[PDB]
Structure formats: structure tokens, C-alpha cells
């Protein structure tokens, strides 16, 4: 009788806007201990936070704090502020008859705040070839819906946001490339914006 | 300093024995073995203290077999090993002394068990210098990688700008694209942005290379193909700036 069940499977969070991971729990024995692992794409399992069955619901202004309900047996994680360092998946896990159960995870997805949105469809052009070739589309809102191809023969990635880490600055990002093909069409299957930038 | 696994990443053929290792942190004295897929989650294998098994009601009836010979190494052996056996195994440690304790994991090894070793492939680097376009319209440069047709999904894509790696302005595909949509076998492709100052890319005294680590057979392995035997390898490509 020892459960650990993340209901929701997939969260979003606006940057610097907060986020609760939810997580709900079953136990037997009276001592247990409850843990947040976040795992980041290098697969890297790190503890956040670690909490104690019989001790309080602490007074903490923490970023990463936590909603111990013992009688609701819940045990809520608060992420205040949220960063695009936070982005990864979070693992809510129990400690019982069974060292570690986990739960099957909860991945984050944390939203940049483009300010200064200028949406283009650039054609670049291969080092050592220029010939085959690639279209990039940069520098659009993070509400933009990018969508994945129809033909089978041209080649859609999803957005990706880089951080310049210098000026506050990030941009959105997704690739297409085809052998065949013109970037004024590549992505008009996705809804593009009014204002988009083809040169 | 933590948790030690080798290998790292594995590909292998069907009926081949795979044998994984983990090395604990001193002076922790329980081991515990887990596995992760997305189907399944985090699943616990088996666990011991003190070189004693506690718990291995998690090992499969047949193929898996996990000891730990002395405090500060522990085995697990997949013999004979099968394509379902593929997955990201993860080895974690205690101090031992309670149930309670924090476990440090390891950075887990990804084993991927073929049918046959037939559809493996190197993967294809080109990188694509920044449009002018971009450049006039932002004063940003951004520079993309196209690593292509490689399969299995063992690679790891890195950019390195004078010699030394960089972390920053990069964002690389969390998951590729399946070249053919509709095929098990199908070859995958993945995609990286490095996007830099107008200034730094028109400096032809800088150096771009994109580094793909490609993941493949072994020196054991064999090859009955006139292509070049897909071997683990590093595929690179790379550009110079250009002023003009």
C-alpha cells in the first residue's frame, strides 16, 4: 500500500510566474519520508526537497517550498519565480516498506517572456555546400503554435528557445529542411504570425 | 565524488550478455538498481546493504541477474539480453543505516538491444552559416547544425567555439525526427541553434564546429556490408566567420 500517483503528466509555467506540481500519496508504516527529484534532459536524478512525516508544514520563503498535508496526504511543490533552469521533469517519490517509490513523473515546461517578438523565416545556406539549404524560423512569441510537417519528404523541428545569456535576451527557434522546396511556404501550416518577416 | 556507472551507453546486439556496473559512494553501504522507460516510470530492481540483497522481487523470472561482490562494486547481467531489455538503467546509494536515507544516483547508462546490427548508422553533420538577412534585421547571427540519418538515438551534440565548448546561445532538439515517419527501423534526425552577436560572427578569427557523438558498434562486433562499419565515432562540422 505504498503509492505515489502525479496526476497531471505535463505542466506549463510562464517565466518568473509560479507554478504547484501536484502529487497525492499512500503509505502503511506511520514513519515515512516524501522527496522531489528533478531530472533534467541529462537524465540526472537530484534531489530538490526532502520532508519528514511526523515534523511541521514549515514557514519557508524558499523558491522551491513545499504543501505538506499529511491528513489530505498530499504533498504539494511550490516553484516560485519559475526560470527556463527549471524546465525538466519532476519525480515525487515515497520512503516506506520500499526505500524509494516514484511516481511516473510530471514534465515542466517553463514558458519565455518574449518582449520584443520579430517574427522571420530566414534561408540559411550549408558551410561547405550552400546548396542544400535550411529555413529558420526565429525571434516569434511563445505562444506561437508550430506544427510538424504533411509532406514526407520535408522536415519539421519544434521550438526551440536559447538563451544568449547576455542582455536578457532569448528567441525561440524551429528548423525546417527539405531535399526538393522554399521557405516562403515551409511553415504555413503553422499559424504564423501577421507581422512575419521574409526578406 | 558520486555514484559511478560503465558503460555509459550501450548498443548491442540480441543474445549478446550485457553487463553493467555501478560504483557506490564511499562508505555507502546500500545499492540500489532502477530502471526507466516512459511506459513504466522509475522501476526498483533489486537493492542490497551491506553486499546482502533486501529486495529483488523487481527482477524479471528469467535474464537479469544482479551480486555485489565487495562494498564498492555491484554487477547486473543481462543474459541473454532482447530488444524489450532497452531502457536508461540507473544505479543509486545510501549510507545504509535507515530505510529513510537520501539516494544518490548515478548518471545511468542507456542500453539499447538491437534485432540486428543491419540499420545502423553514422550520423551526417552540415552546419548552415547565418542568413544576411538576420543579420541586417537583428544584429544576431544565428548558426544551425543538421546531424542526419543516424540511428540508433545515441548521440550527443555538442558546438565548440574556438576549441572550447560552449553552453550558452544553444538549443538543441530535446527529442529528434524520424526521417520516415512510419517505419520501426527509420533513421533519425536532429537539429542545433547557435546564435551569436553580429559582431563575434563576422570576426574571422573565430571557429565554429558542431560535434556529434555518435554511439555504435564496438571493436567485437562485425561487418558483412561494402559501407563503412558504423563504428562509435565523432562526425563533425564546422565553419569559419565571414566579414562579408
Known amino acids: 500500500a505504498q503509492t505515489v500517483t502525479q496526476s497531471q503528466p505535463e505542466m506549463s509555467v510562464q517565466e518568473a510566474e509560479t507554478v504547484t506540481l501536484s502529487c497525492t500519496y499512500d503509505?502503511?508504516?506511520?514513519?515515512?519520508?516524501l522527496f522531489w527529484y528533478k531530472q533534467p534532459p541529462s537524465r540526472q536524478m537530484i534531489l530538490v526537497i526532502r520532508?519528514?512525516?511526523?515534523?511541521?508544514q514549515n514557514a519557508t520563503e524558499n523558491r522551491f517550498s513545499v504543501n505538506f498535508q499529511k491528513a489530505a496526504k498530499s504533498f504539494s511543490l511550490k516553484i516560485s519565480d519559475s526560470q527556463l533552469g527549471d524546465a525538466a521533469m519532476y519525480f515525487c517519490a515515497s520512503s516506506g516498506n520500499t526505500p524509494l517509490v516514484f511516481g511516473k513523473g510530471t514534465r515542466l515546461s517553463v514558458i519565455p517572456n518574449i518582449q520584443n517578438p520579430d517574427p522571420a523565416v530566414y534561408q540559411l545556406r550549408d558551410s561547405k555546400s550552400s546548396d542544400k539549404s535550411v529555413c529558420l524560423f526565429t525571434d516569434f512569441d511563445s505562444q506561437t503554435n508550430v506544427s510538424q510537417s504533411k509532406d514526407s519528404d520535408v522536415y519539421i523541428t519544434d521550438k526551440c528557445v536559447l538563451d544568449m545569456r547576455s542582455m536578457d535576451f532569448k528567441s525561440n527557434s524551429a528548423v525546417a529542411w527539405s531535399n526538393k522546396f522554399a521557405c516562403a511556404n515551409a511553415f504555413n501550416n503553422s499559424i504564423i504570425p501577421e507581422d512575419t518577416f521574409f526578406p | 565524488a558520486g555514484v559511478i556507472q560503465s558503460p555509459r551507453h550501450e548498443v548491442t546486439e540480441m543474445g549478446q550478455e550485457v553487463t553493467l556496473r555501478c560504483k557506490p559512494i564511499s562508505g555507502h553501504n546500500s545499492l540500489f538498481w532502477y530502471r526507466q522507460t516512459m511506459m513504466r516510470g522509475l522501476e526498483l530492481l533489486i537493492y542490497?546493504?551491506?553486499?546482502?540483497?533486501?529486495?529483488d522481487s523487481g527482477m524479471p523470472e528469467d535474464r537479469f541477474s544482479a551480486k555485489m561482490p565487495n562494498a564498492s562494486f555491484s554487477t547486473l547481467k543481462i543474459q541473454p539480453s532482447e530488444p524489450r531489455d532497452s531502457a536508461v538503467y540507473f544505479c543509486?546509494?545510501?549510507?545504509?543505516?535507515?530505510?529513510?536515507?537520501?539516494?544518490?544516483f548515478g548518471p545511468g547508462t542507456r542500453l539499447t538491444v538491437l534485432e540486428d546490427l543491419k540499420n545502423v548508422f553514422p550520423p551526417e553533420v552540415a552546419v548552415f552559416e547565418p542568413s544576411e538577412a538576420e543579420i541586417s534585421h537583428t544584429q544576431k547571427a544565428t548558426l544551425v547544425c543538421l546531424a542526419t540519418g543516424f540511428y540508433p538515438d545515441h548521440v550527443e551534440l555538442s558546438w565548440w567555439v574556438n576549441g572550447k565548448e560552449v553552453h550558452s546561445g544553444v538549443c538543441t532538439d530535446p527529442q529528434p525526427l524520424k526521417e520516415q515517419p512510419a517505419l520501426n527501423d527509420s533513421r533519425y534526425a536532429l537539429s542545433s541553434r547557435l546564435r551569436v552577436s553580429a559582431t563575434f560572427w563576422q570576426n574571422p578569427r573565430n571557429h565554429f564546429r558542431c560535434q556529434v557523438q555518435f554511439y555504435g558498434l564496438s571493436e567485437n562486433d562485425e561487418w558483412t556490408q561494402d559501407r563503412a562499419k558504423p563504428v562509435t565515432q565523432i562526425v563533425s562540422a564546422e565553419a569559419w566567420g565571414r566579414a562579408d
Open positions: 543509486a546509494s545510501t549510507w545504509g543505516r535507515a530505510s529513510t536515507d537520501t539516494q544518490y
Open positions: 503509505t502503511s508504516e506511520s514513519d515515512y519520508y
Open positions: 542490497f546493504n551491506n553486499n546482502v540483497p533486501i529486495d
Open positions: 520532508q519528514e512525516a511526523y515534523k511541521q
